[PDB]
Amino acid sequence: TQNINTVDMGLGYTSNTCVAYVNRVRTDMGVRVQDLFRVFPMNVYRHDEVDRWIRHAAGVERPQLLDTETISMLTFGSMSERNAAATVHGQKAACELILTPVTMDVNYFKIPNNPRGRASCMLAVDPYDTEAATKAIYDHREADAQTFAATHNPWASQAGCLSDVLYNTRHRERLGYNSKFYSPCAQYFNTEEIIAANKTLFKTIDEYLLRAKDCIRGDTDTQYVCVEGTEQLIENPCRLTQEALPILSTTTLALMETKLKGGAGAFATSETHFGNYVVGEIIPLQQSMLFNS
Amino acid sequence: AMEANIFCTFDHKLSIADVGKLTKLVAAVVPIPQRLHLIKHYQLGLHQFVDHTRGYVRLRGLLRNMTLTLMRRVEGNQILLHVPTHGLLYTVLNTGPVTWEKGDALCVLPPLFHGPLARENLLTLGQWELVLPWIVPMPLALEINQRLLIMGLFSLDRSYEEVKAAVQQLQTITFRDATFTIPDPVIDQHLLIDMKTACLSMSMVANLASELTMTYVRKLALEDSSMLLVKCQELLMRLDRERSVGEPRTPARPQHVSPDDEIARLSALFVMLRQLDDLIREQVVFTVCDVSPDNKSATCIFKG
Amino acid sequence: MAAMEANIFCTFDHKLSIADVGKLTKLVAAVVPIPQRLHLIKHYQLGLHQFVDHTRGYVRLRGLLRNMTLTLMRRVEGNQILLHVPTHGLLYTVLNTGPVTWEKGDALCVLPPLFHGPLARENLLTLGQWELVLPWIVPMPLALEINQRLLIMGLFSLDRSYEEVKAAVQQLQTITFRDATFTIPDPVIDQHLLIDMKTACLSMSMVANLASELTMTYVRKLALEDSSMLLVKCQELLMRLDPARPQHVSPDDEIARLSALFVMLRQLDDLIREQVVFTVCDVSPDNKSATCIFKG
Amino acid sequence: MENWSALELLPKVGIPTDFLTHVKTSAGEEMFEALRIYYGDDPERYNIH
Amino acid sequence: MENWSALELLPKVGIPTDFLTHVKTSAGEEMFEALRIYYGDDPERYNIH
Amino acid sequence: MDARAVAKRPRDPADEDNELVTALKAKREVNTISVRYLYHADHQALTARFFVPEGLVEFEAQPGALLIRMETGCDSPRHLYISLYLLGIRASNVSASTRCLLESVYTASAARAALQWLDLGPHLLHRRLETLGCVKTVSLGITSLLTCVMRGYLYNTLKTEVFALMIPKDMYLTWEETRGRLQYVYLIIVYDYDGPETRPGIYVLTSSIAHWQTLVDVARGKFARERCSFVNRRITRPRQIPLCTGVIQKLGWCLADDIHTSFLVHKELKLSVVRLDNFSVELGDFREFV
Amino acid sequence: FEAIFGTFCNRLEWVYFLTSGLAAAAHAIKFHDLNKLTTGKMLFHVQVPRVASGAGLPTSRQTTIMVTKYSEKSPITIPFELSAACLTYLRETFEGTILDKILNVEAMHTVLRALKNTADAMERGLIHSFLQTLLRKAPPYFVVQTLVENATLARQALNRIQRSNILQSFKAKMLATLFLLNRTRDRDYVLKFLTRLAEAATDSILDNPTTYTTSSGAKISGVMVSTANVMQIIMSLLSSHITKETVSAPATYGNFVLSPENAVTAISYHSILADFNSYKAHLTSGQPHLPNDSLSQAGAHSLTPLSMDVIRLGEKTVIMENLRRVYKNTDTKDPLERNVDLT
Amino acid sequence: VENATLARQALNRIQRSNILQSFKAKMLATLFLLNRTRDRDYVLKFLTR
């Protein structure tokens, strides 16, 4: 055994890190949605015949878990999802959020912004002011941060909305669920954490160097939450900003060809075609990551 | 030379390949019929206790008197063997059918070969072979002993299929990480004598106590210091359905039994219990602390 | 407080004759129960003699002996008595007092003394209105026969006339065992039995309800077909009279009834049991010494 | 709450102390654990018990 | 609760201490406002930190 | 064989050099490791590490407790370790004030799984429990790594302090009026069969008694009220077969004189507890009686 | 016949903590009685300089400021084992047959391997736990970059406009600096970036007059570590600045022997202050300042040369270091090899 | 060589898949050398690699 004792002799920070060189990407960068039936197994339809028709259409299995197994299922969780027989790419993820057909995409998707549809940076908020801190992120009498329209996404920004009851960890904790599955979107909805997350500026990044990182097991197909320690920790830059990054997307195959046929700057630009649109890409990784190899 | 050791020899010369099959059992339990020093391999092992007409009870009762002895180290033409001291930890070996879990109680039981083949044997050598007892966890071992007695209770009435359908299910134990078919004591129709010798011991108290006890309840009932005897006399009715004015309100009692014969009914009541007693209890020979990975070796503190 | 000392010195107040000290040298490694477990006990506490009573009940000596702490005598230099207390599970030499053959490998149990044919108890130690009564070490089967009869003695007396009570006590007091005869000193019906006699009869009753009808009919069916030397004797022990298939086959319920029955035989059978102590390995040819292991 | 009355009476060591964001901006953001700023002279230090 | 462990290690003075009523009697009378009597040898005195 | 060889006293390990030191002495090569004195070379006590969920670490953080394993029909965890204090919400013996006290401490979701599992089954509680030992040197974390004792005195490493064993006051009782110089600690579980459900009824019971016969005789005293119930249930419910009015098993023994009352302090809430001192561990299997 | 040509076995490498360039970031000390202590601390004192106010403006009184650092504690543990079978052939030799001696010579080397496999592991764990601590004190570059850019303006506790302006640089510096060699690769833009790191690093409070010093009087400062695949690029693009050098590394750990006066204070009230005897004379003299504060006084007078790499960034000769040498074949994940999620 | 260092354990199913991804991207880009680019620094880097 050994007993080292570190001492923070530095007044200001004496160490710093900058991300440098990608070599590979574990993520599938896929599309397949998270299966809530494996996230909330206990939920079932009231009518008997209806559930037989729903699971048959989604293709989801309908396990007959024993009453003993369900209790541990709601606590420690389990890797309920069967691993794929072959995976040429890697782990997949794609959490889903229903939103307005008349979303103001020109003011939203073109630039990085909160998936909730109302910006909720805690650094902009006055530290240790829980009353004001919870008002700007929920109460809509105040003008919104970023775009000053009160709420681009009424079905997401509201407290108690379908995105809130279904993805906030405390509202999810009241429901039965498998904790081991990892939903990327949950980090934006942790009201009991994010409201307490605000602090003085130097103390905020210090907590960012501890609790902010999340565990993800590395051998399983789909992502799973894991006990910290044995697995390498994964910091998320978005936790400091609470603003998700837009990516390239095309309404139709036609507009996609113009991007692939273009030069190095083609990914950066955004385009529209009547009711169709094409989101621009804020970080030109698509040209860089593949060509850089 | 601090460690005590029980030496053993071999009459047959070992094959060099055979020497390595003892090294796979460095920690296996090696029961010894009687404490000694030099021991011929014919004395070694449970195989000398094998019997033909005798049933499973003979293999188990002799095992209780055997001095369990952990294997130490094979050394050429020798077998080191140490008898564990009480209260010290030792690394035994999980040769038993069921995987161990931490903290489980353990009690030795004779091996039980079943129907379909699986693991068989490795140490055949001139008729004699090195059989080893199973080391089942205790809570499962109580279930095993209950099956062999009840399966012999149905041995008298194999003729009907519904009885055979039940014994077929009692034969199949179902527990954690394991399923097994414990062999039926019934064979060649008639039951083996050692089970029939034991099955009567249960039927004795099941019947002999159904009449002899009636006389002694009424006299002790006068005290009522614990009050239960007022209801204890009605516990002897042996019935489920409520009485319906058939008037068997009071138990039947023996009539004018001879005073000398009355003593014989009680004197023989307990000699049957002395035979049945061996199956009633299982000493905890070992208590595992933490199972080693691969479910092979496991450290255990010796008990008893 | 220091944990009770492994080594105990016993010192006698009364002056000892040479005839006494010579008996102690041959008494070495005998089991000598003590109650106090003090580092320096008086000889009055030594032995079982101080607990004797006018009733001289053999029953009360059985329960009082169970509260005793067994010890092995060692090194009888001079007046001092080195009563070492054995550790559990270790080997120790043992020296017999009661004349019993002691077959090797049997379990042993401490027992209140009986008497052999002389009745003199001769070569016993008398020491000024005091004696050294050391309880016998006996084989386990003898501990059953000496006690299972004793439970019967309180039962049979309950319904019989006093002239018929003495007739049974006269027979049950003697117990042959491994050639040698034995007899129980002053058996005594007492409240010491009644506290135990009642729970036995209660244990006799609960077993009568636990049994399945097939478990009780198993012999009456067996007499219809098979015949054997054991089965003929069992009919003498039972009332004579008072395939249709079993009435109900519920194996999950049948096996559950058996588990409660084992609770009774771990209890009712244990009433005649005494806790085992020494485990014989190799008896000496003189049968005056034997290595032993394990305690109560 | 430490023993702030001691620190201004105990002898210390003068050290260079360059660091980012002023000094009130750093201590005022609680980047250090314990702190005890005061804008005047402190009457409370001469007492001893 | 005091700091009895300091007294159990620090060197003292050989002062005679005659007084009435034995000495264990004083512990049973609470004549002193605080005490920590104990019988056997105490391992705990070595718990320096 | 030599006459001097039998003259020799039994070998003293402490006089001998350490096995790690001896190989270094043959090469005369210093290493950074301090091999001069191996730790835990002198402990008669036997121990084994137990990984534990973080939600059950409370109360156990104070040295001295009881870890009884609890088998479960779930495939994972297959064995949820249970503190005796966690079992107090289940025991009928605990006072409703004492029960409400510690129950607030068990707000962790991992602790919530325990109460769900004791109730769902038909099996009796004593069959699912298994005594293991006592806490010492808690690791504390998301997965606590307790070093539970198997057979011996609890104490701090290097013998610096002898840990006491803690027992709640409600579960402790004294049959004797005058303590003996020695008394064994028998853990005991006694059901009170009734009707809709069979409540437990824990009672740790120090006693001078050692022999099993006299030990279960005094147990028939105050517990005779359950004895009237266990028999009354038999005539009441044919086909139903209640078994074991109670269970006794040895846990260890104590010097008796060292015992005195105390109280634990955790999460602000206090809880008075009987405090065994030099409790040597001596495990004993459950023993049925009616 | 089935011939078997001679067997081979790898030779062990001899890593050391002081030999590594990561040690330049630490002032290592030995302290035998470490197990007893609970917490350490170092109180600070800062009185603010001020400038004269103009007419019509509020002035500024002198403002004393004091703060107290603490000290985190972590341990490490490596199991290793010897089979009792091989262990008993050690001291318990049998007859002196030539065959029996082989098991003695083998068991004696079984211990030498069992120790040096762990003794070598003990040095690497200090490399690993120390680098593990720096990651907890290593804010992402865009955070530190925002400070140096707007530190100067916010003399007061940050304004709500200032806090918003600080947040604006958190994003603008995140979308471009998120990856470097993957994107731009100008040889000057890398040097322009890396030289900006050393200006953003605050100096450690203690100073080292001589330890870690370039020959001919150049004063070393700073250090950095990376995976070999990234250092393989940096050796090329910045080869004009990189030079090998024999750094004067300390030869041995320092020590912090307790003062005899501390031995009383450790028992009297369970607390200690370093060099307690030194403070007494400074009160009687009335002098405020002291020559040193223990931690810089903790030995390490010895020094030894060893070769290292350095770079000329801002006239700060930063040490270069690579940890590929000390994590090869190890079953642990390399701490420098991590990953970054992007929503 | 690009991925050997990370995979101390036997390769993960995600690791094996990223191994396959390099097999396609490298096989096409390096399918022919002198037939494609003839840059001096590129071939000098490719050969020392």
Curated annotation (Swiss-Prot), chain A:
It is found in: Virion; Host nucleus. Belongs to the herpesviridae major capsid protein family. Homomultimer. Makes the hexons and eleven out of twelve pentons. Interacts with triplex proteins 1/TRX1 and 2/TRX2; adjacent capsomers are linked together in groups of three by triplexes, heterotrimeric complexes composed of one molecule of TRX1 and two molecules of TRX2. Interacts with scaffold protein; this interaction allows efficient MCP transport to the host nucleus. Interacts with capsid vertex component 2/CVC2. Interacts with the small capsomere-interacting protein/SCP. Self-assembles to form an icosahedral capsid with a T=16 symmetry, about 200 nm in diameter, and consisting of 150 hexons and 12 pentons (total of 162 capsomers). Hexons form the edges and faces of the capsid and are each composed of six MCP molecules. In contrast, one penton is found at each of the 12 vertices. Eleven of the pentons are MCP pentamers, while the last vertex is occupied by the portal complex. This is Major capsid protein. It comes from Human cytomegalovirus (strain AD169). The chain holds residues 1078 to 1370 of 1370 of the full protein.
From Swiss-Prot, chain B:
One of its GO terms (molecular function) is structural molecule activity. It is found in: Virion; Host nucleus. Keywords: Capsid protein, Host nucleus, Virion. Pfam families: Herpes_V23. The keyword Transmembrane helix does not apply. InterPro entries: Herpes_capsid_2. The keyword Transit peptide does not apply. It comes from the Viruses. HAMAP family: HSV_TRX2 (MF_04019). Belongs to the herpesviridae TRX2 protein family. Interacts with TRX1 and major capisd protein/MCP. Structural component of the T=16 icosahedral capsid. The capsid is composed of pentamers and hexamers of major capsid protein/MCP, which are linked together by heterotrimers called triplexes. These triplexes are formed by a single molecule of triplex protein 1/TRX1 and two copies of triplex protein 2/TRX2. Additionally, TRX1 is required for efficient transport of TRX2 to the nucleus, which is the site of capsid assembly. This is Triplex capsid protein 2. It comes from Human cytomegalovirus (strain AD169) (HHV-5).
Swiss-Prot record, chain C:
The keyword Manganese does not apply. It is found in: Virion; Host nucleus. Keywords: Capsid protein, Host nucleus, Virion. GO terms for cellular component: host cell nucleus; viral capsid. One of its GO terms (molecular function) is structural molecule activity. Disulfide bonds: none annotated. The keyword ATP-binding does not apply. Belongs to the herpesviridae TRX2 protein family. HAMAP family: HSV_TRX2. Interacts with TRX1 and major capisd protein/MCP. Structural component of the T=16 icosahedral capsid. The capsid is composed of pentamers and hexamers of major capsid protein/MCP, which are linked together by heterotrimers called triplexes. These triplexes are formed by a single molecule of triplex protein 1/TRX1 and two copies of triplex protein 2/TRX2. Additionally, TRX1 is required for efficient transport of TRX2 to the nucleus, which is the site of capsid assembly. This is Triplex capsid protein 2. It comes from Human cytomegalovirus (strain AD169). The lineage of its organism: Viruses, Duplodnaviria, Heunggongvirae, Peploviricota, Herviviricetes. The gene is TRX2.
Curated annotation (Swiss-Prot), chain F:
GO terms for biological process: viral capsid assembly. GO terms for molecular function: DNA binding. Signal peptide: none annotated. One of its GO terms (cellular component) is host cell nucleus. Keywords: Capsid protein, Host nucleus, Virion. It is found in: Virion; Host nucleus. It comes from the Viruses. Structural component of the T=16 icosahedral capsid. The capsid is composed of pentamers and hexamers of major capsid protein/MCP, which are linked together by heterotrimers called triplexes. These triplexes are formed by a single molecule of triplex protein 1/TRX1 and two copies of triplex protein 2/TRX2. Additionally, TRX1 is required for efficient transport of TRX2 to the nucleus, which is the site of capsid assembly. This is Triplex capsid protein 1. The gene is TRX1.
